[PDB]
Design a protein around this nucleic acid. Structure first.
Ligand SMILES: [Ca+2]
Ligand SMILES: [Ca+2]
Ligand SMILES: [Ca+2]
Ligand SMILES: [Ca+2]
Ligand SMILES: [Ca+2]
Ligand SMILES: [Ca+2]
Ligand SMILES: [K+]
Length: 84
DNA sequence: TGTCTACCGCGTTTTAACCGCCACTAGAAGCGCTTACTAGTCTCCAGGCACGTGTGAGACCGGCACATGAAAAAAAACCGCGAT
């Protein structure tokens, strides 16, 4: 209601598309998504880890994605919503 | 066997090692003189040794308490096997 949806960025979409792709039973990690997200040809190496860090911070706040536990450094996130 | 990236090789730009020199002087090192300190010698005697003896520390053993590994079995969870 009164909302006009965003269009999440090219890195913010990778978080969703990699977390759905190799969807762990519990908590897909920033380091794992980083490990294989960087095989993508358009990914820029020096900074892209920072962009997946920016993405998940917002993506968790959006009720788009949800994180289960801490582990190493609050680094385990599952895609919250599958619609009813 | 498979995946990821830390290492290697290389060309380019930067840095400071190197060399040869000169100027300055701290301090290494030699030398003569003097005495404090050590070796050496003698005499003496007590510290530390070989020897002997006892008794309590420790080794040994049996009985028990207790820690913990491994099995069997009960409870979670997870890893697929193939469906609209
Ligand atoms: Ca001197
Ligand atoms: Ca004595
Ligand atoms: Ca003795
Ligand atoms: Ca006695
Ligand atoms: Ca005694
Ligand atoms: Ca006694
Ligand atoms: K002297």
């Amino acid at each position: 209601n009164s909302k006009k949806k965003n269009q999440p960025g090219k890195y913010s979409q990778l978080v969703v598309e990699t977390i759905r792709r190799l969807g762990e039973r519990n908590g897909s990690s920033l380091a794992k998504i980083y490990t294989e997200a960087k095989k993508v040809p358009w990914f820029d190496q020096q900074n892209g880890r920072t962009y997946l860090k920016y993405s998940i911070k917002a993506l968790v706040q959006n009720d788009t994605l949800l994180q289960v536990k801490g582990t190493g450094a609050n680094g385990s996130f599952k895609l919250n919503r599958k619609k009813l």
